[PDB]
Protein backbone atom coordinates (compact mmCIF):
# COMPACT_ATOMS: atom_id res chain seq x y z
CA UNK A 1 0.00 0.00 0.00
CA UNK A 2 0.93 3.68 0.07
CA UNK A 3 2.08 6.26 -2.46
CA UNK A 4 5.71 7.29 -1.97
CA UNK A 5 5.94 9.66 -4.93
CA UNK A 6 4.25 12.37 -2.86
CA UNK A 7 7.19 12.58 -0.44
CA UNK A 8 9.46 14.25 -2.99
CA UNK A 9 6.72 16.82 -3.71
CA UNK A 10 5.34 17.57 -0.23
CA UNK A 11 8.27 19.78 0.95
CA UNK A 12 8.15 21.89 -2.23
CA UNK A 13 4.54 22.77 -1.38
CA UNK A 14 5.44 23.43 2.26
CA UNK A 15 8.44 25.62 1.46
CA UNK A 16 6.55 27.76 -1.04
CA UNK A 17 3.60 28.09 1.35
CA UNK A 18 5.94 29.09 4.18
CA UNK A 19 7.56 31.61 1.83
CA UNK A 20 4.28 33.40 1.13
CA UNK A 21 2.60 32.83 4.49
CA UNK A 22 5.32 34.91 6.13
CA UNK A 23 4.29 37.95 4.06
CA UNK A 24 0.65 37.31 4.92
CA UNK A 25 -0.16 35.94 1.46
CA UNK A 26 -0.89 32.45 0.16
CA UNK A 27 0.79 30.47 -2.61
CA UNK A 28 -1.26 29.75 -5.74
CA UNK A 29 -0.36 26.06 -5.78
CA UNK A 30 -3.60 25.28 -7.59
CA UNK A 31 -2.77 21.63 -8.14
CA UNK A 32 -5.13 19.98 -10.65
CA UNK A 33 -7.92 17.66 -9.61
CA UNK A 34 -8.00 14.08 -10.88
CA UNK A 35 -11.28 12.85 -12.37
CA UNK A 36 -11.66 9.16 -13.25
CA UNK A 37 -13.99 8.66 -16.22
CA UNK A 38 -15.23 5.42 -17.71
CA UNK A 39 -18.16 3.21 -18.52
CA UNK A 40 -20.05 0.82 -16.30
CA UNK A 41 -17.81 -2.01 -15.04
CA UNK A 42 -14.74 -0.54 -16.77
CA UNK A 43 -12.72 -0.70 -13.56
CA UNK A 44 -12.57 2.97 -12.53
CA UNK A 45 -12.99 2.44 -8.78
CA UNK A 46 -10.19 -0.15 -8.71
CA UNK A 47 -7.83 2.19 -10.57
CA UNK A 48 -8.52 5.23 -8.41
CA UNK A 49 -7.95 3.55 -5.04
CA UNK A 50 -4.55 2.32 -6.23
CA UNK A 51 -3.43 5.93 -6.75
CA UNK A 52 -4.61 6.91 -3.26
CA UNK A 53 -2.92 3.83 -1.84
CA UNK A 54 -5.69 2.86 0.59
CA UNK A 55 -8.38 0.17 0.37
CA UNK A 56 -11.55 2.10 1.20
CA UNK A 57 -13.71 2.40 -1.90
CA UNK A 58 -16.65 0.12 -2.74
CA UNK A 59 -16.03 -2.01 -5.81
CA UNK A 60 -17.55 -4.99 -7.57
CA UNK A 61 -19.98 -6.05 -10.28
CA UNK A 62 -23.26 -4.21 -10.63
CA UNK A 63 -23.94 -0.52 -10.16
CA UNK A 64 -21.75 0.09 -7.12
CA UNK A 65 -20.87 3.77 -7.72
CA UNK A 66 -24.38 5.16 -7.44
CA UNK A 67 -23.28 8.60 -6.15
CA UNK A 68 -20.33 10.86 -7.04
CA UNK A 69 -17.67 10.52 -4.35
CA UNK A 70 -15.31 13.47 -3.88
CA UNK A 71 -12.19 12.60 -1.89
CA UNK A 72 -10.15 15.50 -0.53
CA UNK A 73 -6.65 14.71 0.73
CA UNK A 74 -5.34 17.11 3.38
CA UNK A 75 -1.83 17.15 4.81
CA UNK A 76 -1.95 16.65 8.57
CA UNK A 77 0.07 15.48 11.55
CA UNK A 78 -2.05 12.33 11.97
CA UNK A 79 -4.09 10.05 9.73
CA UNK A 80 -7.89 9.94 9.96
CA UNK A 81 -11.03 10.43 7.89
CA UNK A 82 -14.33 12.27 8.23
CA UNK A 83 -17.50 13.02 6.28
CA UNK A 84 -19.51 16.20 5.95
CA UNK A 85 -22.73 14.46 7.02
CA UNK A 86 -21.06 12.77 10.03
CA UNK A 87 -19.86 15.98 11.68
CA UNK A 88 -18.28 15.26 15.05
CA UNK A 89 -17.41 11.65 14.17
CA UNK A 90 -13.89 10.35 13.54
CA UNK A 91 -13.06 7.36 11.33
CA UNK A 92 -9.95 5.42 12.35
CA UNK A 93 -10.58 2.36 10.14
CA UNK A 94 -11.17 2.54 6.40
CA UNK A 95 -13.46 -0.51 6.50
CA UNK A 96 -15.87 1.64 8.50
CA UNK A 97 -15.39 4.33 5.85
CA UNK A 98 -16.36 1.90 3.10
CA UNK A 99 -19.47 0.78 4.99
CA UNK A 100 -20.48 4.40 5.62
CA UNK A 101 -20.19 5.05 1.88
CA UNK A 102 -22.60 2.22 1.11
CA UNK A 103 -24.95 3.26 3.92
CA UNK A 104 -25.04 6.88 2.77
CA UNK A 105 -25.61 5.73 -0.81
CA UNK A 106 -28.58 3.49 0.02
CA UNK A 107 -30.18 6.01 2.38
CA UNK A 108 -30.75 8.39 -0.54
CA UNK A 109 -30.91 6.13 -3.60
CA UNK A 110 -32.69 3.10 -2.17
CA UNK A 111 -31.83 -0.47 -3.09
CA UNK A 112 -33.29 -0.79 -6.61
CA UNK A 113 -30.25 0.55 -8.46
CA UNK A 114 -30.97 4.24 -8.07
CA UNK A 115 -28.62 7.19 -8.48
CA UNK A 116 -28.33 10.69 -7.04
CA UNK A 117 -26.46 13.72 -8.45
CA UNK A 118 -25.73 14.92 -4.89
CA UNK A 119 -22.12 13.91 -4.10
CA UNK A 120 -20.57 12.38 -1.00
CA UNK A 121 -17.67 14.37 0.47
CA UNK A 122 -14.92 12.36 2.18
CA UNK A 123 -11.97 14.23 3.74
CA UNK A 124 -8.93 12.08 4.59
CA UNK A 125 -6.11 13.66 6.59
CA UNK A 126 -2.56 12.31 6.58
CA UNK A 127 1.10 13.42 6.76
CA UNK A 128 1.89 11.60 3.49
CA UNK A 129 -0.55 13.40 1.17
CA UNK A 130 -0.84 16.67 -0.71
CA UNK A 131 -3.90 18.90 -0.82
CA UNK A 132 -5.57 17.13 -3.74
CA UNK A 133 -9.10 16.65 -5.05
CA UNK A 134 -9.98 13.19 -6.39
CA UNK A 135 -13.37 12.56 -8.00
CA UNK A 136 -14.95 9.11 -8.40
CA UNK A 137 -17.90 9.34 -10.73
CA UNK A 138 -20.68 6.89 -11.60
CA UNK A 139 -20.19 5.00 -14.83
CA UNK A 140 -22.13 5.73 -17.99
CA UNK A 141 -24.93 3.53 -19.33
CA UNK A 142 -27.36 3.37 -22.25
CA UNK A 143 -30.58 1.73 -21.00
CA UNK A 144 -32.27 2.00 -17.58
CA UNK A 145 -32.63 -0.82 -15.08
CA UNK A 146 -34.56 -1.00 -11.83
CA UNK A 147 -35.99 2.38 -10.85
CA UNK A 148 -33.84 4.40 -13.23
CA UNK A 149 -35.93 6.82 -15.32
CA UNK A 150 -35.84 6.84 -19.14
CA UNK A 151 -33.31 9.70 -19.04
CA UNK A 152 -30.71 7.87 -16.93
CA UNK A 153 -28.17 8.39 -19.72
CA UNK A 154 -28.23 12.20 -19.65
CA UNK A 155 -28.35 12.51 -15.86
CA UNK A 156 -25.11 10.54 -15.70
CA UNK A 157 -23.59 12.59 -18.51
CA UNK A 158 -24.33 15.88 -16.73
CA UNK A 159 -22.78 14.56 -13.52
CA UNK A 160 -19.71 13.84 -15.64
CA UNK A 161 -19.51 17.18 -17.45
CA UNK A 162 -19.41 19.24 -14.25
CA UNK A 163 -16.07 17.67 -13.28
CA UNK A 164 -14.31 17.25 -16.65
CA UNK A 165 -15.06 20.57 -18.38
CA UNK A 166 -13.31 22.20 -15.42
CA UNK A 167 -9.88 23.51 -16.31
CA UNK A 168 -6.84 22.21 -14.43
CA UNK A 169 -8.26 18.69 -14.21
CA UNK A 170 -6.58 15.48 -15.33
CA UNK A 171 -8.97 13.16 -17.17
CA UNK A 172 -8.09 9.55 -16.38
CA UNK A 173 -9.93 7.55 -19.05
CA UNK A 174 -10.34 3.87 -18.13
CA UNK A 175 -11.44 1.37 -20.78
CA UNK A 176 -11.65 -2.44 -20.72
CA UNK A 177 -9.21 -4.56 -22.68
CA UNK A 178 -11.77 -7.26 -23.56
CA UNK A 179 -13.94 -4.85 -25.54
CA UNK A 180 -13.28 -3.10 -28.82
CA UNK A 181 -11.48 0.17 -28.15
CA UNK A 182 -13.47 1.89 -30.90
CA UNK A 183 -16.58 1.43 -28.73
CA UNK A 184 -15.25 2.91 -25.48
CA UNK A 185 -17.26 5.67 -23.82
CA UNK A 186 -14.37 7.22 -21.87
CA UNK A 187 -12.51 8.22 -25.04
CA UNK A 188 -15.66 9.69 -26.59
CA UNK A 189 -15.92 12.08 -23.63
CA UNK A 190 -12.21 12.90 -23.52
CA UNK A 191 -12.05 13.88 -27.19
CA UNK A 192 -14.97 16.28 -26.67
CA UNK A 193 -13.56 18.16 -23.67
CA UNK A 194 -9.81 17.77 -24.37
CA UNK A 195 -9.40 17.57 -28.15
CA UNK A 196 -5.59 17.86 -28.15
CA UNK A 197 -5.00 15.31 -25.40
CA UNK A 198 -3.04 17.61 -23.11
CA UNK A 199 -4.92 16.35 -20.03
CA UNK A 200 -6.21 12.92 -21.11
CA UNK A 201 -4.38 9.81 -19.92
CA UNK A 202 -5.58 6.42 -21.11
CA UNK A 203 -5.72 3.27 -19.00
CA UNK A 204 -6.42 -0.21 -20.37
CA UNK A 205 -7.86 -2.67 -17.84
CA UNK A 206 -8.69 -6.37 -17.87
CA UNK A 207 -5.65 -7.48 -19.86
CA UNK A 208 -5.95 -10.91 -18.21
CA UNK A 209 -9.48 -11.51 -19.58
CA UNK A 210 -8.55 -11.36 -23.27
CA UNK A 211 -9.97 -14.02 -25.56
CA UNK A 212 -7.28 -16.56 -26.39
CA UNK A 213 -5.36 -15.72 -29.55
CA UNK A 214 -6.00 -11.97 -29.27
CA UNK A 215 -4.04 -9.16 -27.62
CA UNK A 216 -3.99 -5.37 -27.34
CA UNK A 217 -0.45 -4.87 -28.63
CA UNK A 218 -1.55 -2.29 -31.21
CA UNK A 219 -3.32 -0.39 -28.41
CA UNK A 220 -0.61 -0.26 -25.76
CA UNK A 221 1.79 0.86 -28.51
CA UNK A 222 -0.42 3.85 -29.37
CA UNK A 223 -0.83 2.70 -32.98
CA UNK A 224 -4.54 1.89 -33.23
CA UNK A 225 -5.76 5.21 -31.78
CA UNK A 226 -2.98 7.76 -31.22
CA UNK A 227 -3.06 9.41 -27.79
CA UNK A 228 -0.68 12.18 -26.77
CA UNK A 229 0.26 10.51 -23.47
CA UNK A 230 -0.11 6.87 -24.50
CA UNK A 231 -1.89 3.99 -22.81
CA UNK A 232 -0.98 2.21 -19.57
CA UNK A 233 -2.03 -1.38 -19.05
CA UNK A 234 -3.13 -2.47 -15.59
CA UNK A 235 -4.29 -5.78 -14.10
CA UNK A 236 -6.58 -5.11 -11.13
CA UNK A 237 -8.30 -7.61 -8.86
CA UNK A 238 -11.04 -9.92 -10.10
CA UNK A 239 -14.50 -10.14 -8.58
CA UNK A 240 -13.43 -13.41 -6.97
CA UNK A 241 -10.31 -11.63 -5.69
CA UNK A 242 -12.45 -8.85 -4.21
CA UNK A 243 -14.66 -11.37 -2.43
CA UNK A 244 -11.61 -13.42 -1.46
CA UNK A 245 -9.96 -10.44 0.25
CA UNK A 246 -6.84 -10.88 -1.87
CA UNK A 247 -3.95 -8.83 -0.52
CA UNK A 248 -2.54 -5.89 -2.46
CA UNK A 249 0.97 -7.37 -2.43
CA UNK A 250 -0.17 -10.54 -4.18
CA UNK A 251 -2.13 -8.52 -6.74
CA UNK A 252 0.94 -6.44 -7.63
CA UNK A 253 3.15 -9.53 -7.85
CA UNK A 254 0.66 -11.22 -10.18
CA UNK A 255 0.57 -8.05 -12.28
CA UNK A 256 4.36 -8.11 -12.57
CA UNK A 257 4.48 -11.79 -13.54
CA UNK A 258 1.74 -11.23 -16.12
CA UNK A 259 3.58 -8.52 -18.05
CA UNK A 260 6.97 -10.24 -17.75
CA UNK A 261 5.62 -13.55 -19.09
CA UNK A 262 3.10 -12.56 -21.75
CA UNK A 263 4.97 -12.86 -25.08
CA UNK A 264 3.30 -9.81 -26.64
CA UNK A 265 4.02 -7.49 -23.68
CA UNK A 266 7.51 -8.35 -22.40
CA UNK A 267 9.13 -5.51 -24.35
CA UNK A 268 6.69 -3.10 -22.65
CA UNK A 269 6.97 -4.62 -19.17
CA UNK A 270 8.49 -1.43 -17.73
CA UNK A 271 5.89 0.99 -19.14
CA UNK A 272 2.94 -0.65 -17.37
CA UNK A 273 1.64 -1.70 -13.98
CA UNK A 274 0.25 0.04 -10.92
CA UNK A 275 3.50 1.80 -9.86
CA UNK A 276 4.11 3.27 -13.32
CA UNK A 277 0.68 4.91 -13.33
CA UNK A 278 1.57 6.53 -10.01
CA UNK A 279 4.85 7.78 -11.45
CA UNK A 280 3.19 9.35 -14.50
CA UNK A 281 0.59 11.15 -12.39
CA UNK A 282 3.10 12.35 -9.79
CA UNK A 283 5.34 13.57 -12.61
CA UNK A 284 2.27 15.35 -13.97
CA UNK A 285 1.87 17.29 -10.72
CA UNK A 286 5.58 18.12 -10.51
CA UNK A 287 5.49 19.58 -14.02
CA UNK A 288 2.58 21.81 -13.00
CA UNK A 289 4.13 23.07 -9.77
CA UNK A 290 7.39 23.91 -11.56
CA UNK A 291 5.56 25.56 -14.46
CA UNK A 292 4.09 28.21 -12.13
CA UNK A 293 7.27 29.43 -10.41
CA UNK A 294 7.87 32.28 -12.91
CA UNK A 295 4.56 33.86 -11.95
CA UNK A 296 5.34 33.69 -8.23
CA UNK A 297 8.73 35.35 -8.68
CA UNK A 298 7.26 38.19 -10.73
CA UNK A 299 4.59 38.87 -8.10
CA UNK A 300 7.23 39.23 -5.39
CA UNK A 301 9.49 41.20 -7.74
CA UNK A 302 6.75 43.74 -8.46
CA UNK A 303 5.97 44.21 -4.77
CA UNK A 304 9.60 44.92 -3.90
CA UNK A 305 9.82 47.53 -6.66
CA UNK A 306 6.73 49.36 -5.41
CA UNK A 307 7.82 49.38 -1.77
CA UNK A 308 11.55 49.89 -2.33
CA UNK A 309 11.48 53.60 -3.17
CA UNK A 310 10.12 54.47 0.29
CA UNK A 311 11.66 51.86 2.61
CA UNK A 312 15.02 53.03 1.28
CA UNK A 313 14.49 56.06 3.53
CA UNK A 314 12.63 54.41 6.41
CA UNK A 315 15.47 51.95 7.08
CA UNK A 316 17.82 54.86 7.87
CA UNK A 317 15.46 56.58 10.32
CA UNK A 318 16.89 58.20 13.44
CA UNK A 319 14.59 60.40 15.57
CA UNK A 320 17.43 62.88 16.21
CA UNK A 321 17.88 64.00 12.61
CA UNK A 322 17.63 67.74 11.96
CA UNK A 323 18.28 67.10 8.26
CA UNK A 324 15.08 65.08 7.90
CA UNK A 325 12.98 67.63 9.78
CA UNK A 326 14.21 70.51 7.62
CA UNK A 327 13.81 68.48 4.42
CA UNK A 328 10.25 67.69 5.48
CA UNK A 329 9.67 71.38 6.22
CA UNK A 330 10.75 72.45 2.73
CA UNK A 331 8.55 69.78 1.12
CA UNK A 332 5.41 70.79 3.01
CA UNK A 333 5.92 74.49 2.27
CA UNK A 334 6.50 73.82 -1.43
CA UNK A 335 3.41 71.61 -1.56
CA UNK A 336 1.23 74.27 0.10
CA UNK A 337 2.44 77.05 -2.20
CA UNK A 338 1.76 74.90 -5.26
CA UNK A 339 -1.68 73.83 -4.04
CA UNK A 340 -2.57 77.41 -3.09
CA UNK A 341 -1.58 78.86 -6.46
CA UNK A 342 -3.48 76.06 -8.20
CA UNK A 343 -6.81 76.93 -6.60
CA UNK A 344 -6.51 80.70 -7.11
CA UNK A 345 -4.49 81.29 -10.28
CA UNK A 346 -5.40 78.08 -12.11
CA UNK A 347 -1.72 77.27 -12.65
CA UNK A 348 -0.67 73.66 -13.11
CA UNK B 1 -13.40 7.37 -40.59
CA UNK B 2 -14.89 10.89 -40.41
CA UNK B 3 -15.96 12.37 -37.06
CA UNK B 4 -19.60 11.47 -37.79
CA UNK B 5 -18.98 7.73 -38.15
CA UNK B 6 -21.36 7.04 -35.27
CA UNK B 7 -24.33 8.63 -37.03
CA UNK B 8 -23.47 7.12 -40.41
CA UNK B 9 -23.64 3.59 -38.98
CA UNK B 10 -26.82 4.41 -37.05
CA UNK B 11 -28.54 5.71 -40.19
CA UNK B 12 -27.84 2.33 -41.79
CA UNK B 13 -29.47 0.47 -38.89
CA UNK B 14 -32.55 2.70 -39.08
CA UNK B 15 -33.19 1.46 -42.65
CA UNK B 16 -33.84 -2.18 -41.70
CA UNK B 17 -35.20 -2.24 -38.13
CA UNK B 18 -37.59 0.71 -38.57
CA UNK B 19 -40.07 -1.26 -40.70
CA UNK B 20 -42.72 -3.87 -40.02
CA UNK B 21 -42.49 -7.50 -41.12
CA UNK B 22 -39.03 -7.62 -39.56
CA UNK B 23 -37.50 -9.48 -36.64
CA UNK B 24 -34.66 -7.90 -34.65
CA UNK B 25 -31.98 -9.92 -32.87
CA UNK B 26 -30.39 -7.83 -30.11
CA UNK B 27 -26.89 -9.31 -29.80
CA UNK B 28 -24.67 -8.37 -26.86
CA UNK B 29 -21.75 -10.03 -25.06
CA UNK B 30 -21.97 -11.37 -21.53
CA UNK B 31 -18.56 -10.09 -20.37
CA UNK B 32 -19.93 -6.54 -20.16
CA UNK B 33 -22.70 -4.89 -18.16
CA UNK B 34 -25.96 -5.47 -20.01
CA UNK B 35 -27.05 -1.93 -19.14
CA UNK B 36 -24.42 -0.59 -21.57
CA UNK B 37 -25.50 -2.59 -24.64
CA UNK B 38 -26.09 -0.69 -27.88
CA UNK B 39 -28.21 -3.52 -29.30
CA UNK B 40 -30.94 -3.10 -26.68
CA UNK B 41 -30.97 0.70 -26.90
CA UNK B 42 -31.64 0.48 -30.64
CA UNK B 43 -34.23 -2.28 -30.28
CA UNK B 44 -35.98 -0.52 -27.40
CA UNK B 45 -36.24 2.73 -29.38
CA UNK B 46 -37.69 1.05 -32.48
CA UNK B 47 -39.71 -1.74 -30.79
CA UNK B 48 -40.79 -0.48 -27.35
CA UNK B 49 -43.19 -3.37 -26.64
CA UNK B 50 -40.75 -6.17 -27.46
CA UNK B 51 -43.05 -7.68 -30.08
CA UNK B 52 -40.22 -8.31 -32.56
CA UNK B 53 -37.06 -8.09 -30.46
CA UNK B 54 -35.22 -11.24 -29.36
CA UNK B 55 -32.17 -11.05 -27.14
CA UNK B 56 -28.98 -13.04 -27.72
CA UNK B 57 -26.09 -13.44 -25.27
CA UNK B 58 -22.93 -14.33 -27.16
CA UNK B 59 -19.86 -14.70 -24.89
CA UNK B 60 -20.59 -16.87 -21.86
CA UNK B 61 -17.18 -18.59 -21.74
CA UNK B 62 -15.34 -15.24 -21.42
CA UNK B 63 -16.98 -14.00 -18.21
CA UNK B 64 -14.81 -12.96 -15.29
CA UNK B 65 -14.42 -15.80 -12.82
CA UNK B 66 -16.83 -15.35 -9.92
CA UNK B 67 -19.92 -14.07 -11.77
CA UNK B 68 -22.50 -15.38 -14.23
CA UNK B 69 -25.39 -14.18 -16.39
CA UNK B 70 -28.28 -15.84 -14.55
CA UNK B 71 -29.93 -12.46 -13.95
CA UNK B 72 -30.18 -12.02 -17.73
CA UNK B 73 -30.89 -15.57 -18.89
CA UNK B 74 -33.75 -15.74 -16.38
CA UNK B 75 -35.20 -12.47 -17.74
CA UNK B 76 -34.97 -10.72 -14.36
CA UNK B 77 -32.40 -7.91 -14.61
CA UNK B 78 -33.96 -6.23 -17.67
CA UNK B 79 -37.10 -8.27 -18.35
CA UNK B 80 -37.64 -8.67 -22.09
CA UNK B 81 -40.96 -9.86 -23.49
CA UNK B 82 -39.50 -12.78 -25.45
CA UNK B 83 -36.61 -13.46 -23.07
CA UNK B 84 -32.93 -13.97 -23.79
CA UNK B 85 -31.13 -16.86 -25.51
CA UNK B 86 -27.54 -17.71 -24.65
CA UNK B 87 -25.01 -18.98 -27.18
CA UNK B 88 -21.34 -20.01 -27.19
CA UNK B 89 -19.53 -19.62 -30.51
CA UNK B 90 -16.09 -20.51 -31.86
CA UNK B 91 -13.24 -18.49 -30.40
CA UNK B 92 -10.69 -16.65 -32.51
CA UNK B 93 -8.25 -19.51 -31.92
CA UNK B 94 -10.88 -21.88 -33.35
CA UNK B 95 -11.61 -19.73 -36.41
CA UNK B 96 -7.92 -19.93 -37.35
CA UNK B 97 -7.77 -23.58 -36.25
CA UNK B 98 -10.31 -24.74 -38.85
CA UNK B 99 -12.64 -26.13 -36.18
CA UNK B 100 -15.78 -27.63 -37.69
CA UNK B 101 -19.19 -26.23 -36.76
N1 LIG C 1 -9.48 -9.72 -13.24
C1 LIG C 1 -9.76 -8.42 -13.46
N2 LIG C 1 -10.93 -7.91 -13.01
C2 LIG C 1 -11.23 -6.62 -13.21
C3 LIG C 1 -10.28 -5.78 -13.91
N3 LIG C 1 -10.80 -4.56 -13.99
C4 LIG C 1 -12.00 -4.61 -13.38
N4 LIG C 1 -12.26 -5.83 -12.92
C5 LIG C 1 -13.49 -6.21 -12.21
O1 LIG C 1 -14.61 -5.48 -12.70
C6 LIG C 1 -15.53 -5.23 -11.66
C7 LIG C 1 -15.91 -3.77 -11.71
O2 LIG C 1 -15.00 -3.02 -10.94
P1 LIG C 1 -15.38 -1.49 -10.71
O3 LIG C 1 -14.16 -0.67 -10.92
O4 LIG C 1 -16.12 -1.26 -9.44
O5 LIG C 1 -16.34 -1.13 -11.91
P2 LIG C 1 -16.88 0.37 -11.88
O6 LIG C 1 -18.36 0.28 -11.65
O7 LIG C 1 -16.50 1.04 -13.17
O8 LIG C 1 -16.23 1.00 -10.69
C8 LIG C 1 -14.82 -5.63 -10.39
O9 LIG C 1 -15.34 -6.86 -9.95
C9 LIG C 1 -13.39 -5.85 -10.75
O10 LIG C 1 -12.81 -6.91 -9.99
C10 LIG C 1 -9.04 -6.42 -14.36
O11 LIG C 1 -8.19 -5.75 -14.96
N5 LIG C 1 -8.85 -7.71 -14.10
N1 LIG D 1 -14.34 -17.31 -27.06
C1 LIG D 1 -15.43 -16.83 -27.70
N2 LIG D 1 -15.28 -15.96 -28.72
C2 LIG D 1 -16.33 -15.48 -29.37
C3 LIG D 1 -17.65 -15.90 -28.96
N3 LIG D 1 -18.53 -15.29 -29.75
C4 LIG D 1 -17.83 -14.53 -30.60
N4 LIG D 1 -16.53 -14.64 -30.38
C5 LIG D 1 -15.49 -13.93 -31.14
O1 LIG D 1 -15.95 -12.66 -31.59
C6 LIG D 1 -15.08 -12.24 -32.62
C7 LIG D 1 -15.80 -11.32 -33.57
O2 LIG D 1 -17.09 -11.83 -33.83
P1 LIG D 1 -17.87 -11.10 -35.01
O3 LIG D 1 -19.17 -11.80 -35.21
O4 LIG D 1 -17.06 -10.93 -36.24
O5 LIG D 1 -18.25 -9.66 -34.48
P2 LIG D 1 -18.95 -8.76 -35.59
O6 LIG D 1 -17.93 -7.70 -35.94
O7 LIG D 1 -20.24 -8.23 -35.05
O8 LIG D 1 -19.16 -9.66 -36.76
C8 LIG D 1 -14.66 -13.52 -33.28
O9 LIG D 1 -13.25 -13.58 -33.27
C9 LIG D 1 -15.18 -14.64 -32.43
O10 LIG D 1 -14.19 -15.66 -32.26
C10 LIG D 1 -17.73 -16.84 -27.84
O11 LIG D 1 -18.83 -17.24 -27.45
N5 LIG D 1 -16.61 -17.25 -27.27
MG1 LIG E 1 -17.41 2.81 -9.66
UniProtKB/Swiss-Prot annotation, chain A:
Residues 28-294 form the Dynamin-type G domain. This is Dynamin-1. Residues 235-238 are annotated as: G5 motif. Residues 38-45 are annotated as: G1 motif. It is found in: Cell membrane; Membrane, Clathrin-coated pit; Cytoplasmic vesicle; Presynapse. The modification Phosphotyrosine is found at residues 80, 125. It is linked to Developmental and epileptic encephalopathy 31A: An autosomal dominant epileptic encephalopathy, a heterogeneous group of severe early-onset epilepsies characterized by refractory seizures, neurodevelopmental impairment, and poor prognosis. Development is normal prior to seizure onset, after which cognitive and motor delays become apparent. Developmental and epileptic encephalopathy 31B: A form of epileptic encephalopathy, a heterogeneous group of severe early-onset epilepsies characterized by refractory seizures, neurodevelopmental impairment, and poor prognosis. Development is normal prior to seizure onset, after which cognitive and motor delays become apparent. DEE31B is an autosomal recessive form with onset in the first months of life. Phosphorylated by CDK5 leading to synaptic vesicle endocytosis (SVE) activation. GDP binds at residues 41, 43-46, 59-60, 206, 208, 211, 236-237, 239. Changing residue 41 to A: Impairs assembly-stimulated GTPase activity. Does not affect basal GTPase activity. Does not affect membrane binding. Does not affect self-assembly. The modification Phosphoserine is found at residues 306, 347. The gene is DNM1. Residues 205-208 are annotated as: G4 motif. Catalyzes the hydrolysis of GTP and utilizes this energy to mediate vesicle scission and participates in many forms of endocytosis, such as clathrin-mediated endocytosis or synaptic vesicle endocytosis as well as rapid endocytosis (RE). Associates to the membrane, through lipid binding, and self-assembles into rings and stacks of interconnected rings through oligomerization to form a helical polymer around the vesicle membrane leading to constriction of invaginated coated pits around their necks. Residues 136-139 are annotated as: G3 motif. Residues 64-66 are annotated as: G2 motif. Changing residue 291 to A: Does not significantly affect receptor-mediated endocytosis. Changing residue 334 to R: Significantly decreases receptor-mediated endocytosis. The chain holds residues 1 to 348 of 864 of the full protein. Homodimer; homodimerization is mediated by the dynamin-type G domain which promotes assembly-stimulated GTPase activity. Homo-tetramer formed from two dimers in the absence of lipid. Oligomerizes into a helical polymer that self-assembles around the vesicle membrane, when associated to the menbrane through lipid binding.
